[model samples]
Target chain A: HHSGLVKMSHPSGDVEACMVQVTCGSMTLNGLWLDNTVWCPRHVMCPADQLSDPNYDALLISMTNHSFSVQKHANLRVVGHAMQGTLLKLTVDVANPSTPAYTFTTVKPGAAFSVLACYNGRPTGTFTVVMRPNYTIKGSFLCGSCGSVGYTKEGSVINFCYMHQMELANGTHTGSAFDGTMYGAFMDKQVHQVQLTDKYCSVNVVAWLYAAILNGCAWFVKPNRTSVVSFNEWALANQFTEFVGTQSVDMLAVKTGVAIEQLLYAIQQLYTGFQGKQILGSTMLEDEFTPEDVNMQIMGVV
Target chain B: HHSGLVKMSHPSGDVEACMVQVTCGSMTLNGLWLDNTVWCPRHVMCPADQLSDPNYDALLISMTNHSFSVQKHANLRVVGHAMQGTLLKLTVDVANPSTPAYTFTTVKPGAAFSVLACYNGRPTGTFTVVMRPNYTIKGSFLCGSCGSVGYTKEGSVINFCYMHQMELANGTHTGSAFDGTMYGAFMDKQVHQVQLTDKYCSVNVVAWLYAAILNGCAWFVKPNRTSVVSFNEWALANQFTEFVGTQSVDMLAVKTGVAIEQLLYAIQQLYTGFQGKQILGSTMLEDEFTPEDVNMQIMGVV
Candidate 1:
């Protein structure tokens, strides 16, 4: 089989200009990386010197030569979208060698392996885009905003947030000023608890968060960063990034220049916002900042 | 009622060291970006001066204003999520208050607009983490490859790429040598077009135009520029910035020192590998580096 090159689309709009070179049982993908090497399975290990040959899998053996200089490829396996220390056991189809779906097998005693398949703690996925029905306001997804932004999935009962960065206009500023422009094709991920009508959960999402003081800090090698998956085809997929839904506790009303005492009614208003039949609802509290009391109220509502 | 701050789970981890401050009907989110202002929805436009308040919406207006600075009371509004110019008319529900789903009525003679609902993507739904079903000895979704490595994703219905980035103590290496590392949590957006099986309507992807000299370049803020979403939480999500995969062509077979030409699909031999039972098939054309012949083969298939 002469496998030369094939173009593919991932993000949708842009194109990935890749060159596939298949010779003998092994194959190589060029373009993204002129000098990149892929360890073709089935073939046995390469001799020490062949490690640097262009026709050899030199990219795999040499850390200083590859992209991710992080952990060395010692013993790791494919786990869900990530990897496990070992690897994913697979079952291959014989006759037709094209379908890439392999049967994954867990080596652990049982499924208690906590396989990373369903890991919900901050995971990423396909950001399937859709517009709310019947709304006609040449509306756009600007970079600046106060409240939260997000979408719901078909299977799950939850929705996720996708914040717009890089503002083109001016409005209110409370958080970091770095919310500038960003990719419309995103690396989706998020929490699973927040919901459509959960009043308290709804408000907290767009609400400001701060603390007296505390701490943290953090990872790995700076890969060969050269050559990238072309986003040419994916460049113009959706409009929100240049442009942006839901009717959740949709809107909150507040009188300007008010006092902390007004927060009570604000909370009432938020509760009332849910009443508007706007997909959802929520309102901010106007009152003295009370840590414990407010915390308790939020606790009670949840 | 004090609208004190609350620590929420976005990237899903321990609290992001934040507290809430609820005062007046209006609110302020004050962490991450000290002296920041949010463009809360209910509040109307600010005083001309406050309009320029770095604390308010300077970030907001300045995209319409000068970008940058710091402030605690900067004036801003609800942006990034939805937008404002005239406003999207609303159809409210009387029976419920928190359902959040409101019928958006755009008065431009009709409702024909789409909106962005803050959405998070690729949230491990089916983690259906399976290779494929049925078949034989089937090897795996793993590696014993050299150099940085990786597998692959969709594009060609059966275009299953398996490049093992990062290498182990022992493994094969026969390909270009550029396996690298990259971001994990990403907003993977895509058009619902393109499938794995159908006669492969794929053509507009990447191909080298280096013949006799010709070129190309393009896009927005250059996808590689700095200023990315704070994936501080996502960095720790997955692995194998260099990885691998495949089967339907489960694994490819190559004899160490073979002819540069003539790869046997006698793929005792995997110019590549195989897996899955999906559809769509293809064959190869054998020829020299003739620009026209190679180009034509690709053109014909695409």
Candidate 2:
């Protein structure tokens, strides 16, 4: 009660890879009777020919139909048409073919077929059909707005005009999954909008820099007398004396800009010293602050 | 119209002490016309003949009859009987009489009468009756076989004897409201019956006492090692070596009980002597184990 031979097709202009396998019954080779069995096409195997180019791409093999000669007491046969310019026919004699035999042929810009053969109520062998297509685009898009001057290759991938710069400019290359040039274009557009608006607006670069410095300084500067004593004593005893001088300024005047220029310089120096101390303290706290060392010193003062 | 008096009697001897105070208008008199308001027969105004004798167990009081006259002015008369060995007659003057008087007479048992008098209803009017009973036994019955002690008393008020004893007993007494000595008796009988059927019960008092001693020794005899060392050193240095000789003990044999009896006894005495040393050590340890005495006598010890 097996059904007729079933075929599947892929019309998308890309390589579609699939796995074909038989899940039930083997075929017996005899002279008169042909057998049928259920087969499944599952996991990715190889590219469909729809994505291949005529000049740079080709479909290697294709399937037409399956043939079984039971009277010969022989294996199943897979038939397909191969082409350079005109069609040439070929067949695979599969008595009990092992998995994944390589069948190679060349196809250009057209459909092709391959098949599996069955005998005596089971499948003797299997094959596949694939399509290959040629892909070409001729025009180019300039990516000059991408911070660095760039050009598209094959109207797809981009490369920077200057090859010697420290940072290289490359957009999405063809055949890559991600569109990198789109991201670069979005960022460039944002920069260009800001640049255009900045012509009319007074951009306070130093003010923002000073604000960042003050924000960073707040973390290290002593907030009160207790904190001053704790932080100063900790730093002095732990070889972080460089931080003590930076935190000596009154924080209220710094916050209120009572002496704006001096306070800014003080906050900037504090931030610089704090960053240096942080890097040094990380190593000291992790490697040098052992329990034995702590116990040897009174109240961890050393 | 006032309802006339009706006399009644108890035939079954169930009714006990009953005292009837006679009231003319708002005045209540204890012995018919005797106007002392204290609970009686308690006062000297209650004549000796009217007071109940201590032996007679039950007494009853009844009002026999009364009459009134409305000539010239309103007057009242009353008549009643008091029976002990015989009937005692009573009469009351209702109105102004030349002499306000009452008459009494003793008759045979079960003898009673309806007597009356007339007098002007003035301020000095009086009424009379025979004496009241003091002590009486109202009723008595046996309690059920409910595993409890039961008792009877010789007065109008029934005070429960079993409940009184249960309240006053020293042991942890357990029983229902009606159970006391009777429950104890039942428990004793049950134990005797069990002993009769099963004769193998043998209680070892010495074994129980030994178990208690072993548990106490195990819990309390384990020495604190730090405290022991501190005590030993402190005692040796502080001229309390005699205390150390008494208080120190062998820890291993104390736990395992494997030592000879003489050695164990010596160790026990040695452990006991260290009690004073422990107190001193604890005091020193509290002050960082460097008391003023150590600081004064020993160089760099503190």
Candidate 3:
């Protein structure tokens, strides 16, 4: 036995379980993904202690819980269904009859995209397209505030709110190779809550912080001038483009590799435009990584 | 009267004092620049305590002393003449009448220049041209190692050693509007050692560190490919070009502003090429500036 609890918790405690195989170490138990929640059958207890402590098992937990009550256990693994953590591709098509039309596509794996808001949505301010491996896509703006984060299945499209839906302006959004079907999932959906070990959580946070840095740099180059030949050439050379490829971001992340968050965070603080009324605190990744460790991970120094 | 000793100490205690007035508060002591060394006349004492503390007095002390002995005086100022701390303009003509000729020009005030050494001088390695306000120019390479730091007087050309002098390769070196005068000053010359108040000294150090950063970035951009249209274009756009303007460098220095030296130092350590067998220690600017202060000053934040 690993030594702690392997909790198979569901929002509805009394939900009936199915023959779902939950594996930890050598133990497997019957459970079921019911109503977007997973539950363990009655009297079917396995060694919760045998689960991975700080790391998620390959059969990743997919849930929508952000809080964890501390227990004095040597080993603990929360149980849920496997998550489709990779966002392969997506698109943004802004078509307004009166205003200039713009389109964006994310072709690379784990790449990032950002655009400027024409009016009230950070008006003339920037809003970024943030993609997490966990099939979560957010239209992040005004510091770390999300207009909406779309949760999708492996083959589905992003369906959360964005400037397209909220702005008086009109546009179309799509995902997963731009398949014609409009997939929908709100930010408040149960699927949006995913299980996260500390490491997993830190990885996501680092991803967000990295995206913020790109956004800050984008602000420096000025979104409007980004289309101009002279400054556009410079922006691209400096990796300040609207669309940053996965390879470029990864390379920069590692090269600029961690506590590097402080540097990144300081950059955001100094620029001020990156932060909304709400600030993304520097201490967000405190327990999991040192500044250099954070730098190492963010920059791939780790 | 000021509280501390104001003795005008020169290399030769027996040197003749002159009618030259050394201004401190209301006291003006007689002194003169004798044989490359500034000397105070017999019994011509003023209140050194009255001289600016921490900040350099209008007449900056131009000496090459690097040591500071501890003294409990509330106010103490070293005596020296005014310094010409501005590198107005210069040029680098690297023509061998053999291999490819490369010419560099410093058009801006306080602009920095660097070039690559094709052979034994860090063979295929990068060498930077460091310009200090006090008429000091150095060919800095391999971790702050100076091939030669030419000290010039106002309206005169630099006379320090460089790869052109030491390397087997032949080159014509010129300065001050490309004047043909081959001015020469050894590192051991008395003129090389200028008196310095801590602030003046720190500014010089900041200039050096900033130069080191540019060199490191140049190393990243690859010296040889700097001429290639694609890469060269990118380099120039990213401010990674060989000749960085004073405005650009200052803008970056202030924008990337201070104790930012650790980040900078860490960058050097991580990159390693910027450092030679001799390490440019991080603790070099221990007192008188915080890391952010260093960052602010280097970035022009200060």
Candidate 4:
């Protein structure tokens, strides 16, 4: 009777209009400001506009048809993925503030869930919470001369990363290895994201995050004023470089009983460039594996 | 005026300049735009920013006290002294977006806080509200073809850093001989902050509102590189180097049980340079003392 009101739903069901006041757990969607009184189509893949929260730029709306009706859903992807669930790695952003940025998480395995959109393509901002609770490891790589490495296990893969610090030494951070502090060393940086098939392969590291803190710390210490020299040296050498003036792996061989050459070979086998060459002073991985794997295995276990 | 306002009843018995805005919780005074009817002072530090929405770049303003009072907080730091808190560490930066760009944080313990400028300092714009609830963690040290040691209060520090997959593998995440993963290897990450500083120390994992998607990845992996390999090798050695590759420990042991070889000596000596020794590579002890010592004790649990 009014703007867009037809009696399709008024079979004795009389009302000016129907509004969708949605509430799921901590989320709510009020369709009261909706343009029309009639329900919208079951699935909606609207512009980035309909999507609030900048964290989410893409929206996936899904609907499941029931015998008599349809269920609506709305979802947001804070992080994307081709893995089982979403793979989100987090850490403190030292520059802005000390706290990690994202607060929303996936529901723990079997914890809880809601039908997003409808029976669902995209649940309204569908965010998944990892079943794992936060585990604060008292132990980490004491970068800056100190820090820590954190990891997670999901299905067949395990995600591990690093955090750096300056507790143990009095000298400037990442000394001997370079001058001034090695600011961006081992930062939570992403080396690559590859997709061989339908699934995606991506690599991120906590160590890089640590290095990333100083993304360009060495600052071309010499001529050309480009990248820090050590980064280039380290990449080519692969599994071994200098730290505060010492090579950490030189010790790995002795402690673990593996031949130094074997470890070095492992480093070589792993560190390949886009052209199957070793990474020398360059800024990327030498081979195809996510450098993350090396971090996961090398030393095999001391 | 209202019950909260005073001057012992303004019925001719009170003062005129006395206004009641009892805003001790928070209020800001910007002579830039003062409201004639209001009495807020300039630069008050209140707790609202980084605690709530992660997007705020400035501090929140708050008001307390009255009568021509001015506090020149000298402001050595934006964050502050202990209450409910955790004092964290930070480093420098270089690469794209340069500088540890956005540093903000919440005190880890039951803490409290202030605001900045725009209303405060460096506040291009100010917005603060701390509603983020604290979450706990319960998560891994997943070593691979390569790996680094990240720890938190479990075993002895490895004179060596890689956690080979098979050697000494059978232990708990934090088991005897401090097995496979050096249970306490990379720890010390938080040890510095926990010193005799008077304040108790603690740690937390995870932060990302804006970073949930990965801030600051390598801006220039050369001009054109698919993945950053330097990051990989650095990951492989999993120890100290520049971060692009292995800064592996350059010390190899002669034996174990006795002779005070590699490991025991690595414990005392310092190794640097490109080559020398390497860490051992195996899996599990099937032996003794490597567990015989356990806590770094019973012989201190070696």
Candidate 5:
């Protein structure tokens, strides 16, 4: 008896008797079970045959009255045409008076309970029940934030906000593919923030601190000028044209894996015109050198 | 008096008796009484005018032939040109036999002292006193292990051992500005030692540890392809060539700044031709295209 209690209750006493029936755990009662001779019970009934049937199931059972009193049950079957599976329909009379409202509770098969009231000399207030499975949604989106991919299903929309979008026109930007872009962009942004912060400080202080601490330390020593030439050649051989000798300083800072933010900030203060510039050699040279000729010469960019 | 001391100390010690007569003090001798007969005592006497003069001063005294122990009751005087302004030379015969050694101590002028023994009616020692200023060397240099600048004295030459000589020449194949020639070569030989001691083992260990960690993390989500790109750019931007493409999978371990030595080692194991071989696009195409001509054409290097 999977279909549980089917309740039909009304607060007004004016309604007459109401009748309901249960078959294969599906309820189909119709006559006046709320007449003066019959009182509205707190629970509804389901037949043993319907209760034992696997396909029959119950959802919510509710009733409404003229006084706006609507009573609901957690598990109940109502009198109606047998639904596709087990749809319960509950109704109440608006004119009824002296009929108190009713509600329902679930009971599994083989569970025992005493009836507190009756409909036709049969125990009236409780029955077995079942419920449908619940459903929801879970997912991720690309190009949600400025060149970023979001990992949540809700409030996530693909939109381009930065110079580069996470998802280009061709392919989906998987988290696996976008992580490096995120990291690179993150590092670039962090460096920008540091540059901004350091612009307000003294350049001399920054240079002195860098010279004293970084220059002497073996890890952060300035690249040997001669070695830089060979190193630049190596970079060029590997198809990396964005950076050159001067950009090595920034690359060294990145490779240090230290507080790149602080170092970038300090370095920015030491060299002027670094604002809103990329870490690439061309950008650094353009920002640092005044005339276009000087910039081009400094960057070796004819 | 200071000038007198200075003049007295120069050009060796010798003076005339007339010079001693100008000193400020005088001396007296006791004459022996002969029998009871009234007789003039035989005594060497100074002229009364010279004894009464106040412009001369005597610094020492010498007496002879009395065998009586000489004792100074007050400051005494000697009247002889050779003795004027002379310094008392106190010599202990530390290297002699049958003579007790003497210790020298500071004595105040006019201090009373009794002599225990005498020779020639004076102290039993040859005292040829002279005056000269004392001095010592300001600095010194040892002729061992002269580094960098070499033994920096006139007429000094450095002779390197056979191995050191070879190292000196070979080390400077890559030139350095300071010590730009043979000396630079010598310093260059030390670079290998410095690298071995300070860098290789520790750096490799750290690189490997980081590599392992990154590799572990890469297993779960797989590293972002763009991380490889960023890393490739970073590596290329630094000094590591020998790879192609922004998402060069082969270069990821190296580019991530992980166990770089090990990664290089592993690459050597996997690609037998990796070491000492340029990672040319032609080479990659050759592996795919078979014929060298086809490979060259494909790579656009023909």
Candidate 6:
């Protein structure tokens, strides 16, 4: 009769640590989550000699809090070997006391639910974490490439897209020379353009001067209003060139006399407008400008 | 900027209990498992008014010992409603300290990792539970029917197949009348057939008498050995009918003078022999007499 019963506890008397073996494919472990609350493993014991095996890379859940960590050979080189790029899927059952049982069911049913990749502690996927009545969780893991500079979150790379606001690093340009820095790019994009109100037009002009100065072409700035207008049109058309960094929404708000919060909302509307349109060859800047990236640039050092 | 970050902590300042909502299908919750160790859910809170909703059934992990439970509307009727038959899949990541990290990866990669359905506390599926060093665990849940009397383990029904011993339930057949009880059934199966040795012959005789007596046909047990042999032949031909339940190996051991352990091992060998054969119309007794069921019957009260 006991044959059917899997001894939840090993005779070895060591409950905290248990040995694990894998040979390719999958081997299901039945009755892993018993009672209700989830069990945490403090130690994951593996074959010591096999640590250096290139196939040793595996993703597992092993921590106190529900945060995940991705380990690779480089990370493991400190201790011994790297166990990275392993994927996993899990399922759990739950029941409530004095009730039939409220299950904290999985999001996916009868299929590969899904795994989330995280860099640092942020999720990169468009998913929500729900804490059901049953506390135990269910999910999967997928080891993916997030490049060398940054880690992955929900299979997306998360890295700092630095802003080119404070200093011109690509060597400043003078006169009518094209400034391929961030300031020139935003000016060409007319990101600071506002309504034609009398007060707003002055703010736009000042914003235009900042772009001209940052391009090392403050010589283009003139005491005459007609030259200034000419310079603004020229700067918008030719002074700015393609740049790699993101724009400073904060700087835009300061120069254009728009509230930072309101400017972001306005930018968001523009993004939404582009997102809804299907016009071809619109130079929509869909991929180049993400509200998320824009916000990160503003929050980051200018 | 914080919108991208899931505030793991709730504004309610409550960490132990959290509310959940569902609208069918599957919803992915990323970053639920972090660090390495798994987080357990102590309580599973569900909507109060919607307890009676038929769509409330879901499988989840919510316990302390890592064991699982299945609940239905009947079980939940006590408090509000039943939350039964919900399935779940989980994935967790683990890393070793001072090491790259030996992940306690999942059994199924990019696929639906299976789940176990347990009744009482036994695994019904043919899978193993491994303890990896990462401490956290991964698995999935499946909601299935295991009949009214038993619960499912690994999606298999686990029910006690009582042996028809001690007393007669369907009344008894006297004399040459056929007996459809367990004794007649085992006798027909001739599970006690052994080598033709003098010592074994006597034991066979006694075993035959017990079977006859159990069928309420003790009159078949004659005083003379010759008459008993005649009755035994009659029984070998036709004295029993098909019956439910399993045979008792313990009773067979006592009657046939075979050691209990050895009898079980011998039965196991017989089962293996039958299992290896692929003959047609062999009356294989594959489904009728499972070694596991036989063993369970013997271990149960005789």
Write model 1 residue lDDT over B1-302, tens digit each, in one string.
10111111112101111111111222211111111221111111223234222232332243322121112223222222211321111111111211211221111100011111110111111110111111000111122111111111222111111111211111111111111111111111111222111110001101111111111111111213211122212212321011111120111112112111112211112212233111111121111112221132222111
> lDDT (0-100) at residue B296 of candidate 1?
24
TM-score (2 decimals) of chain A in model 3 = 0.23
| lDDT digits (tens) for residues A1-302 of candidate 6 | 00111111101101101111111112111111112322111112123333233222232322112222222111100111222212121112332121211222222111111112222222222111211111111211122101101011221212111111111111111000111122122221212332211111222223323332332323323333323344334334432221212244346445444443332232223334444332212212222222222222222221
Kindly indicate the candidate among 5 and 6 with the higher lDDT. Answer: 6
The docking quality of candidate 4, as DockQ, is: 0.01
lDDT of 5 by residue, A1-81 (tens): 001011101111111112222222232222222212211211123333433232323322322222112221111223332
lDDT of 5 by residue, B1-302 (tens): 00000000000001000011111123222111111110010111223354233222221233322211112211122222121111111111121221112222321111111111111111110011100001000011111101111110111211110000111111111111111222121232223422111111111222222333332322212222233344345444433323232222223344454433444333323233323232221111011111111111112111
lDDT of 1 by residue, A1-302 (tens): 10101110012100011111111112211110011221111111223344223232232343122222111102112111111111111111112211122222211100011100001111111112111111100112221111122222223222212222211111111111112212222111111222111012212221211000000000001212211112112212311111000111111112112222232223333333433222111122211112221221122111
C-alpha lDDT (0 to 100) for residue A220 of candidate 3: 22
Per-residue C-alpha lDDT of model 4 across residues A154-180, encoded as one tens digit per residue = 322323221122211211111001111
Model 2 chain B: ten consecutive residues of lowest lDDT: B132-141
Candidate 2 local lDDT, A4-69, one digit each (tens): 011211111000011112111122211111122111111011133321222211322322344212
Candidate 2, superposed: residue stretches over 4 Å from native: A1-219, A224-267, A270-276, A279-302, B1-302
Stretches of candidate 5 exceeding 4 Å from the true structure: A1-143, A146-164, A168-216, A219-224, A227-229, A239-302, B1-302
| DockQ computed for model 5 against the true two-chain complex using alpha carbons | 0.00
Against the true structure, what is model 2's DockQ?
0.00
> Which residue window of length 10 is worst by lDDT in model 4 chain B?
B1-10
Docking class of 1: incorrect
**C-alpha RMSD values across all candidates:** 29.9, 47.9, 28.5, 26.9, 45.7, 35.4
Q: DockQ scores for all the models shown?
A: 0.01, 0.00, 0.01, 0.01, 0.00, 0.01
